[PDB]
């Protein structure tokens, strides 16, 4: 009855209200937590991984921040994290991410379960709002790129650590 | 219907009428606890931050009173605790805050219609008409929110650097 598994039933609660629902839940994990929380987690993870892929492939090929100095972060994005933890910049990034996560995540997860809005809006449309067909097409494109770049960032990091990054931006 | 966060509506109906209302309460602490205590704490924090920023600037410039060994505002706390009058200032603050115990306890549970952070220390009638009162309340709470960040930055920059007046 499913579309990604056209031999074994169709998963419950995956009726098709969310975009990109092909019924791929072989483990039936849509019952532990509400589907709004799962969609919010998928979208947040995808946005984080797309920004992570862009940042990794831009830093690794060579680009430095305003006054980013010369340290082992500037050598590669491999050691950039361990460099910036010691310099304390990761604490500032954690503070900014924590502030936005308090406001955005607390509001966004508190109100779907109460009932109030689509799972993952944030209302920062930045342009395209009137063409609702393009809105749903962009939702589908967003979740597809989300899954693709979750896979892409996983592959990037595992490839680089499997050879300890001998300076390979194709990797 | 929220103003600061336009993807929400009114983080509990507690945020409906008071001054400086922008619908900004993502963690729903306005509806979890009574908002009069929150406004008292906010106004009290902002007033403390305002006078603390004014004092930290003036001691760092040269305004020093009689005696009071001339040291920077970073070490002024320890210098005056070892001197002694910090304890007397603490005693005076404690007396004022015992009166504040009485004021807040009367305000929260009936029998007194006091506004949060109100008092009645208004010698010059700058809040006689209600519209002037609303305007002065908005200016006061905006100054509170600004001066919290101002004094926090002043203290942090003074602590991490050696110390100057503009704090780099």
């Amino acid at each position: 009855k499913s579309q990604a598994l056209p031999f074994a039933e169709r998963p419950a609660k995956l009726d098709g209200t969310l975009v990109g629902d092909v019924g791929f839940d072989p483990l039936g994990l849509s019952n532990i937590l509400p589907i709004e929380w799962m969609r919010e987690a998928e979208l947040k993870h995808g946005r984080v991984c797309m920004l992570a892929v862009v940042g990794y492939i831009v830093v690794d090929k060579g680009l430095r921040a305003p006054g980013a100095e010369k340290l082992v972060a500037a050598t590669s994005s491999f050691t950039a994290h361990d460099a910036a933890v010691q310099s304390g910049h990761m604490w500032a990034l954690l503070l900014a991410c924590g502030l936005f996560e308090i406001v955005g995540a607390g509001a966004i997860a508190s109100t779907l379960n109460g009932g109030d809005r689509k799972p993952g809006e944030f209302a920062l449309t930045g342009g395209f709002d009137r063409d609702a067909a393009k809105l749903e097409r962009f939702k589908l494109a967003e979740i597809k790129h989300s899954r693709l770049a979750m896979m892409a960032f996983s592959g990037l990091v595992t490839q680089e650590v499997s050879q300890t990054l001998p300076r390979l931006f194709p990797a | 219907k929220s103003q600061a966060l336009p993807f929400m509506d009114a983080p509990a109906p507690l945020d409906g009428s008071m001054a400086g209302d922008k619908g900004f309460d993502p963690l729903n602490l306005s509806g979890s606890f009574d908002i009069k205590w929150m406004r008292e704490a906010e106004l009290k924090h902002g007033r403390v931050c305002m006078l603390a920023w004014v004092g930290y600037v003036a001691v760092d410039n040269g305004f020093y009173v009689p005696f009071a060994p001339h040291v920077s505002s970073l070490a002024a706390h320890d210098a005056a605790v070892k001197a002694g009058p910090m304890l007397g200032l603490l005693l005076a603050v404690g007396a004022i805050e015992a009166i504040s115990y009485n004021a807040i306890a009367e305000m929260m549970s009936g029998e007194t219609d006091r506004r949060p952070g109100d008092f009645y220390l208004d010698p010059f009638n700058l809040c006689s008409t209600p519209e002037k009162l609303e305007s002065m309340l908005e200016k006061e709470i905006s100054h509170c929110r600004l001066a919290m960040f101002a004094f926090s930055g002043v203290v942090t920059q003074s602590a991490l650097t050696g110390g100057a007046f503009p704090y780099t």
């Binding site: - | 979890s32 606890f33 009574d34």
Partner: protein
Amino acid sequence: EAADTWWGDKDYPPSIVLGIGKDVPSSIFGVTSGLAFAIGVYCVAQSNLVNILSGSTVNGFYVAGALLVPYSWGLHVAAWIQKQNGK
């Protein structure tokens, strides 16, 4: 006087048994219960992982954090009370 706090004919106590925290939703209670339990267990573990000494190693922040373990009990009980009440 006081409030009718007896709940012997009901399966859950009313929300008024929480006093000043009678309007806090259940999710905040549970999250703060877990956080207070974790912080308190860490603070009391900093007294047996490191031998507490006569004045040298007392660390009053760990003492004040040690009071979160009995506080974490009350928070997860209040989480259940608000959950049955629907809040």
